[PDB]
Design a protein around this nucleic acid. Sequence first.
RNA 1: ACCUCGGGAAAAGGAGUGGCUCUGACGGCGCCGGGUCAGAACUGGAACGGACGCGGGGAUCCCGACUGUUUACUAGAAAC
RNA 2: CAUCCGGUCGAUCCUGCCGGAGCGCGACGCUCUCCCCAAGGACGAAGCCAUGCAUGCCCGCUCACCCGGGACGCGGCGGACGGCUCAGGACAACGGUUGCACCCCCCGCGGCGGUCCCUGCUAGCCGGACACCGCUGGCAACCCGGCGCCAAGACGUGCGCGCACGGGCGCGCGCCCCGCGGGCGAGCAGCGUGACGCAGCGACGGCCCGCCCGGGCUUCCGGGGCAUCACCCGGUCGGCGCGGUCGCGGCGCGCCGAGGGCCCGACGCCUGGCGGAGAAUCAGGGUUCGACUCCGGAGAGCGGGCCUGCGAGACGGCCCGCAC
RNA 3: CGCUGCUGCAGUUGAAACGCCCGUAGUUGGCCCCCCGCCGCCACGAGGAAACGGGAGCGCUCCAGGCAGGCCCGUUGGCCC
Lengths: 112, 151, 260, 173
Amino acid sequence: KSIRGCIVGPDLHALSVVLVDAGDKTLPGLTDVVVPKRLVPKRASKIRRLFGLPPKDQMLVCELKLKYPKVQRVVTDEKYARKQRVIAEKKEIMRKSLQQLEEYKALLSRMG
Amino acid sequence: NQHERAYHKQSQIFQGRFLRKDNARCLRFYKSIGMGYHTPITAINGTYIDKKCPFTGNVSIRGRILRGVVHSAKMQRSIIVRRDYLHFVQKYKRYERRHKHVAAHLSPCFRVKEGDIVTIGECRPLSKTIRFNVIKVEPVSEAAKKRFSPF
Amino acid sequence: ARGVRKHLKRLNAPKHWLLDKMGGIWAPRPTNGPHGLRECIPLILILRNRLHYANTYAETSMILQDKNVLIDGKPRTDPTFPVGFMDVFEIPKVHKTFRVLYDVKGRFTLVPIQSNEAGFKLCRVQKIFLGDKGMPYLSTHDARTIRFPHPDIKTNDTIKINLKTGKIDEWYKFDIGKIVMVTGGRNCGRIGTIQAIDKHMGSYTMIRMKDTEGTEFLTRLCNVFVIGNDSPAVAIPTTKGIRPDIIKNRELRLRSIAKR
Amino acid sequence: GITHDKMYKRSKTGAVQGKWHKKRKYNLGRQPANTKLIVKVTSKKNEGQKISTIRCRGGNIKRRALRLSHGSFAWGSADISHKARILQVVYNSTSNELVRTNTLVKGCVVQIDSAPFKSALSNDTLDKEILDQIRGDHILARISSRPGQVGTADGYILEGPELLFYQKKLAPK
RNA sequence: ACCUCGGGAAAAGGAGUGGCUCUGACGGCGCCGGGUCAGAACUGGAACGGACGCGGGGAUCCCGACUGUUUACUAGAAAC
RNA sequence: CAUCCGGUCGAUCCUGCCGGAGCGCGACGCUCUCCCCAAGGACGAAGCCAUGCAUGCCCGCUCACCCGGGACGCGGCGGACGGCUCAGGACAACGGUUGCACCCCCCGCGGCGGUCCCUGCUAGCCGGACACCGCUGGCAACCCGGCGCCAAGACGUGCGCGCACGGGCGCGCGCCCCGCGGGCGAGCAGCGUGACGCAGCGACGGCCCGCCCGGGCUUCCGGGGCAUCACCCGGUCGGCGCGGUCGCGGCGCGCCGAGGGCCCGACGCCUGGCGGAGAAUCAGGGUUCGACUCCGGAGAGCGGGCCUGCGAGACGGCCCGCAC
RNA sequence: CGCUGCUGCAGUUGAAACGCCCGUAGUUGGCCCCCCGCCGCCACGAGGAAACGGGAGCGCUCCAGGCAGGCCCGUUGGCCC
């Protein structure tokens, strides 16, 4: 694709700029209004950092029904059980397979 | 040993085996392909190395096993075989005597003259024209005429 | 052709499916599964064509999606799921249990079985290999990989799988005097005892089997499938693979039409 | 790109062939990457061991060695093996150009640092020919692996009638 | 192309060439001579038979086959 | 499904062709009551294209709003199949028969699920970081820029059990050969040890293996015409060592040798030349055609080149040169 | 159209035996051994897509078609190429 170069030239019809220093002579519109975020934290770790906490959460900023961001990255009792259950399933697989290996070697010794 | 650019060793036998107690470890690899074929005593007891020899090298005879006369042994460790076959047509109930030259690999163990009946076994592509290796040699009286022979 | 083939033409699809030539340009292409395309019939053809339980392909999805059909005791919801020799096709809602065996002609037949029969499934060990840490493993025709096989069971033997436990209940060896059904090939369905094992080293072992009628039939040992040691130990089709001759078949056809 | 197809080649009789199709991904060949031995470790550390994985057919990653400095070298008789810096490539059967540029390819005779194998000097009756090389700090070895495909330069210490062939080749200089 | 099969022909046309740093060959071995012919890097304002020495070429037609010879001191020719 | 007949003479018997007579499968003329079945811009223009359409579906992630109706976006899989055409290509493609002890593979099926470290765990579960989105623009159009918010089964890491464990290494059969075998027809597989390496996957568990399916090659036999084409080829033919590939191989290179193919037609040229299953006509034997339905190949104006992916040298993907 | 001739054409004179001889490739070679190995050979099998072409059976009203159907071999759709 065709792209202009990263140098300012008199051809540019548009320039995009950001404010890196202010201090005095506050700009008429740039510093006039603080704009609120459109969305509030959704990740639970971010939500707990927001309140300086570090499975509570649940409470959240509400916007009028008051819409709530579905909680994300929070270990619910069901999630905690799932992680423990899957850990147990892999542990059982290790137990059963090792037991079979020892038994098979014994059967092989029985026949020589 | 200076004309050769590289030292040719059998991959299977370790060069450190040529040190003391030669009797303790085998210094020669001599695999036996089956199909009712036998490793020659020349392969078992041969100074030659050949990595494409079917008795002492890293190749496997698998697939079709054909038998044919030697057409030329001029190429180095390679031989051209003249497989003779009849082709039948229907319009004339007669046949056409036809010949096909197949390129095989002579093992250094086997001695061949142009005319000997060879037995060739299919192998992995060994070259652009070579997919066969000689596994048996049948000598001929040199003044053997020619004779169209389906073997 | 740039990649895997996802479509099957009706004229291309195997003759044992018995798909009408005018039925469609396309034929059901079986998914990859326990059986190969040639050695299997899709579940759409074993329901919409044989039992007529579903009158259209969409209805085969509706009854398969509801897991009403059970294959080898597994829900097997896929419409194109392959069903092959020895798979247990049972529908509990209609209370019908079927085992797929081969008929004498060579088409697959859904044989009615009993609850004791439904439990076990017969498998042939194609190969024994040292895979996964040199651990011994067997491979059955129905794509079943069983680790730690009994050291004795060799290849070409028939194992019996529990299905619920997936354990080998018993092994029947491949030997002269053993009941065998030839699966696939010109001689398909035929049941006989092995009478000869001709090795033909480097090519194919040639098995000659003799029917009770005394008709000797020879086939490659891959098609041969041991059923039991001296009796099938499985339901066999009503014909029992004796195999009719063409003039006998004509007589049976005439008899059926007369009683219309 | 590069093609290993035989359609471009002439027939056995030497006849021209016919191009029936355009080149295919399956018959693709890649530019060879000569593993240069870093003998300039003292001069600069910017050139470190650089092995690059490449995407192949079936998503089978192949590790291509661009620069290498060390390898696992094994003295088979004594069963003494240690990771060793490779000092230089001295003798390659295919060409002397690979020896000058010090490319690491399989079967190139390499001189390895003997500082790891210095312990072997203490046990005598362990091959005098290897022992006097150990004292000298350079041992004749050969790369036993393919650096372009494996990504490593493993080898073995030249011994028996092999050591004699390659020491005779490098004997005048 | 043509041809008296000898030629035409250096036909017509192209490409390379320096310096360094190496590697092969080749005899007389322990030794010990050779100076040619290859091949590779690396370099240099895009340079190299770097001066010098040293064919421009192709298609025709006429005449005399040719190498020769000649009017020293105006004709070297197709003349002799 | 075994047929002839008219034409050289003044007449005759022959040879010999010419013309008829049958069928096909296209064109053309003329004419048409009804129903059934049915090919259909292939035929020296693989010339060229206006217009519309031919590839979507899903919700893991909703503080878009209809309240979960869920828009979009992100993520997933499919877009490599299918549809089309027959230009190229004449030991090729293709058809039967082989091998891979030289290989690659998504989906599914059935197994399997131990993963050293140091630093440094948060595992009751970690980061950051964008898209949509909002705000502000350039822009004929195409196309997108900045700033700000905020998520995923996405991404980046990572809590793992030293029979830890991906790759590749080094070493470990013989004693003339063949006869238990994890496995074979065959020394193959697997592993034991010594070093290297530290792969994957574990932030809603998959590395891995068998099977399947498709592919890559490969073995034998068949695989146009022309001699007003008789000699041809020099990576051509072998060997050796590397590289490269999914892998074998002159596939490529370095080096050594001089081979290889031919009147059983090599080689060169030519083809209004895809091959096969087949079709037309026909006593038998045969002849001719194989654009098209099914199968395999090839190609999407022509050459190349590429990315993504398990698979495309993809053209309803991109980059470039030419033609338009 | 036995006017391409394998079946199955013609060459004294209609078209047509090379002027002759040697001779390689090629093609072709008498008789003879019963009982053996290799060949071709003939038979029969395996195994390899159907469609098509046959072809069993079935009255689409007949038919070209199709694989149907009818309380039925486990109703079929065999079998061949």
